Amino acid sequence: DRGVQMLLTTVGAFAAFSLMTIAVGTDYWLYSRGVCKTEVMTHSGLWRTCCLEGNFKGLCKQIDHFPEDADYEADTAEYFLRAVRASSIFPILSVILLFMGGLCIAASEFYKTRHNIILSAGIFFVSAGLSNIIGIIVYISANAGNSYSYGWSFYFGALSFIIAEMVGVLAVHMFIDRHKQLRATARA
Amino acid sequence: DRGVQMLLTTVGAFAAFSLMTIAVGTDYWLYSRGVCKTEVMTHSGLWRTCCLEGNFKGLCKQIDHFPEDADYEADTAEYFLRAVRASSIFPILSVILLFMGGLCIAASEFYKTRHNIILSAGIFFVSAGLSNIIGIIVYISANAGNSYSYGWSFYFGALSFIIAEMVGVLAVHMFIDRHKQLRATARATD
Amino acid sequence: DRGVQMLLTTVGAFAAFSLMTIAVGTDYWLYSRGVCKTEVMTHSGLWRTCCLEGNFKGLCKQIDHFPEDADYEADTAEYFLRAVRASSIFPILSVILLFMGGLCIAASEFYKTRHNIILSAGIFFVSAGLSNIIGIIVYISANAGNSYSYGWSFYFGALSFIIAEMVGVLAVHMFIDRHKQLRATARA
Amino acid sequence: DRGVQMLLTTVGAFAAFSLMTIAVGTDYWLYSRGVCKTEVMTHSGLWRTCCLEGNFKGLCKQIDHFPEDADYEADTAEYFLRAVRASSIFPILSVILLFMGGLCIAASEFYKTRHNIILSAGIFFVSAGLSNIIGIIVYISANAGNSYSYGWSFYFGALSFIIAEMVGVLAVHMFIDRHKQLRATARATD
Amino acid sequence: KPGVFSFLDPLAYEIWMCIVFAYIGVSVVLFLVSRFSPYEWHTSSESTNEFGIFNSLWFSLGAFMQQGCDISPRSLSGRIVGGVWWFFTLIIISSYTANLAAFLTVTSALSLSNVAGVFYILVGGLGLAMLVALIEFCYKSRAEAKRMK
Amino acid sequence: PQKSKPGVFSFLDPLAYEIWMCIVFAYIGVSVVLFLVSRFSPYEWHSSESTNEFGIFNSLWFSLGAFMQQGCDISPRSLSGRIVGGVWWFFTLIIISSYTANLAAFLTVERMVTSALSLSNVAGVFYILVGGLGLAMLVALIEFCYKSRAEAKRMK
Amino acid sequence: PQKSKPGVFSFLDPLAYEIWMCIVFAYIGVSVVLFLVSRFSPYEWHSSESTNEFGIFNSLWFSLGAFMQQGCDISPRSLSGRIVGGVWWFFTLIIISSYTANLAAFLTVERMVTSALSLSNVAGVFYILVGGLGLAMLVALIEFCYKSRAEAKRMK
Amino acid sequence: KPGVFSFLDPLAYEIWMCIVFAYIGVSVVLFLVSRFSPYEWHTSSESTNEFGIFNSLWFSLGAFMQQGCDISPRSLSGRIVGGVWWFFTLIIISSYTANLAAFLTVTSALSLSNVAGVFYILVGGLGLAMLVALIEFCYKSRAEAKRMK
Ligand SMILES: [Ca+2]
Ligand SMILES: [Cl-]
């Protein structure tokens, strides 16, 4: 049904947006050993890492994305990857693309005569999914530079990517159905 | 040809069930060195191990599925595999599914009107074969975890799996033929 | 044309039979170092090996297919392979099959009302080819038990196999054409 | 669209021929250490090697394709490869085939009735590309048989091969279009 | 102490997760570029291609499994997706085979205890497929019974 | 004593005999399940022709082709058939990679009881291939003879 | 100093750059020759439709599929086209085997200037795949926009 | 000193010759079992299958090259031939790849001097195919010119 499809697509869009917004704004991206001052269990996110045990429990410290190493013989690829991870450009791009898809799906309901808004929403949703993929790869690969595990914030982003792709599929299906109905009306 | 197909299906079903029951009951699964007292040529099945030749020839002892000591509990996967082997749930499940397939075959031969019973029998036979495959894999994996050989009970189980799959194919063919005949009769009448 | 095809089939059958008969009846199967008495260049065949240089040039000696070795721990597979090589069962079987195929072709020429003789000839020819394959494999594998090369007898047998398979293809094509002509006559 | 296709085909043919001739003539194929006197940064093409920088900057010497001594004629394969490289037969053959393709294009543009000229031009262009590939492989293999780099003559040859293949595709398309138009006219007239 | 799923050892967990993510993304993009354009539909309306979302996922799985398929993309964007997926698949599967050959050579025949996991996965997939087939058959039978009333 | 050369059937060495028997069983079961999920439903039947071509023989051929990494003329189209095919594909990938990891090393191992492969290490597969060709020829000839006798009896 | 991790495009390491450029050239030439031998003859044409579907784009797709060991919906049927296909198949077999011999070892080599593969060694292929998906999306959107503008101008 | 054809090193030339012999035999047997029976022809007369000698050789080559085909045998004998050829092909190609990895692991990138031989074979095949296509075209053109007179 058109109403069922619209409800499912809107619900998925909102759920994905909320999950990704929580993922960006939370500090449970990774569990690893470290120091929250300036080596106990630490939970890390995108911008800050905090300890979970010991005397320094509950203290959060900002992530140093540019460590003061010897720095000799440094390829620009590592600096570019570190800058991409520090700026979190792809998670933020995914957030903005999801929000723009949500506005497009909202606009189509108030602009039912216009059909390319739904296609734009689908494009935005699948682009947000691809942005999620690139951001996840960037974050994991930057983590490379001995036991670690990811919290629910990382898996929140994973489910956000999956839901965004599913919602994009549903939006493109709605576009197909609208154009097919228009063609059938024109034929008769 | 329906009658000869029915007879072949019944004969194969009974043969597979009998072979699986004999294989499960009998202890001629593996020939390997061991002891029957709570190193000589012994034979072992699913429940008990007995020795051949020697002074303790013909003495059977139950298999201990949790050897060594200290009750090493560090990984749950090994405990799960050992429990699955000890219960022998998959060969027995294969036997049960074969029995339900035979019962379905008999009920279909009695009712002669409800066609879904043939499909249920075929499904039961296929599932019995799959359960036999799983049980064989579990048994061999637990055995791996001194030259050895497999007895005639193991090959009885293998033949049971093969015949069960054959009977499942025959039953599905019978169901398809019944639906085709029904459709042809419906087309002719209308 | 049917006459051209039959002429080519007969010519190929005769050429293959002659080539294999030369291959079995010659002593240039293999070139290797050895002794022709009871270590100079020696040319070997299926039954005898002869020298090509030195004081013993021109002297031929029979091939010992059952050497007097220690013989302990000898599997029956090696003995069976040695027996197959010594008997040359597959080259002789190929020769017999080629001759029988030629006789079938001649009979079909003299029994034109009968059509299964051509199919029998094709079966005989392809079976002779497969026999050639097995025979050369047996001979090479038995040669395993450091420079060696094959003479023109082995390659004569190889060309005999190729020609036999080609002639079998032609004979089966003739069978197909005869049956097609019969079916066309029956239809009209 | 026939005229624009003809113009593109002629432009590409001329570009490929010019690039191949320049690449063959010029000596900026490889940058490597060497000597120009009968170890400094030198450049080498297909015929001669010249040095850059230093006191002997700008001095060119002909390449000796049979280095070392003792005239080691042990294996004929190496001698064949060295002769093939020294003759430079494949790049020059590519140049010749490109010239014949251009000549065929020009002749077709005049006759306008014999359609086999376009097919011949396409065949010549394809063969020229294949000869260029073979020449590149022979050159690199002989070079392999100290960091090095490839100059702009090597990439001129590569671009020549690419453009020659593109023009061959265009010429085959033109031949197909001419035959299609002829068939359509024949069907319409009869 | 390799587990029942030791055949997944040559690649890391992150690689497997990103493989699933990439498979989903490639299939979705294939469906999008195949079916979004109204000019690729002609006259219900039948598309010029058989590349729905289900068929796109099947094509992607066949490409990654080195097994082939009965359909192939024909448009420019669809073929771009297919080619980039082919390149990714070739690299990933070749890397897996090379690292597996390295892992198995740390000449002893492989034992069944090393592939029991893949056997279990196969039987579980067979059971799941049978369950879906019977559920679909029951749904169709119930619909037919309701329509016949 | 003398070093033992690999046997005629040394191509089965890389995997244990238990794995070989389990592979045969898995192949049979997969073919049966594929045929079942393809053909059992009367809603897949149209005197009547099935929507798909996945009979028992065709299912066995498909499974053999998938295991040999070859492929055939048919492909499952239903959701359940595709689940069966995909899981069989994953199984084939894992098993074939494990088998072909060190086949050449397994074909030349000498036991007491880099070099090019010799024909003695592949004579077994050559023998099996020729035997298969002969078996196919015999089956085809038997089929032709039976058909000819049946046609003659029909016309007589 | 610090050990250098393999680059983002370390998957090209097993073969030299000369081999890569020669592979690209061989692929282009094989596609062109396949198209030529398939479509040049007017006797293969029937307003008129060709006997085969081996146009330039389809030939390129076939060659790419053959090189990626995937296969496509078409296969050459003529004697000349089959020679091209077979020789390209032999070339692909040799080259792909040589490339995939030691890919994993080439993806993890550390240089001063067994372990599981990590995502850092495959981030390059993941980046390329996502870029390809984006490029395909852009091309499809451009095609739709151009078609819509053309249709609007046609109706106006 | 490996030659231009060093990619054939992992197998002995005897194996290669027997491979050609086996390929010829399998193709011939495929043609025979596909086309010999008059009961497989129905009504010129059109066969039930597309397995002529040329198509049989093409199928065998595709099977050995790990490339697939557009046709597959359907009869019992034809499928027996195809299955035994598939088994032989899998064994032989897997052995070649394993021995090639061993030969190349006697991490240095491969050089073009190791594959120049396969490149030469490819270009020679392309030239031969073009020659056959042009000869066929010339034959057809001459026949058409003679018929038009
Ligand atoms: Ca390998
Ligand atoms: Cl017991």
Ligand SMILES: [Cl-]
């Ligand atoms: Cl120069």
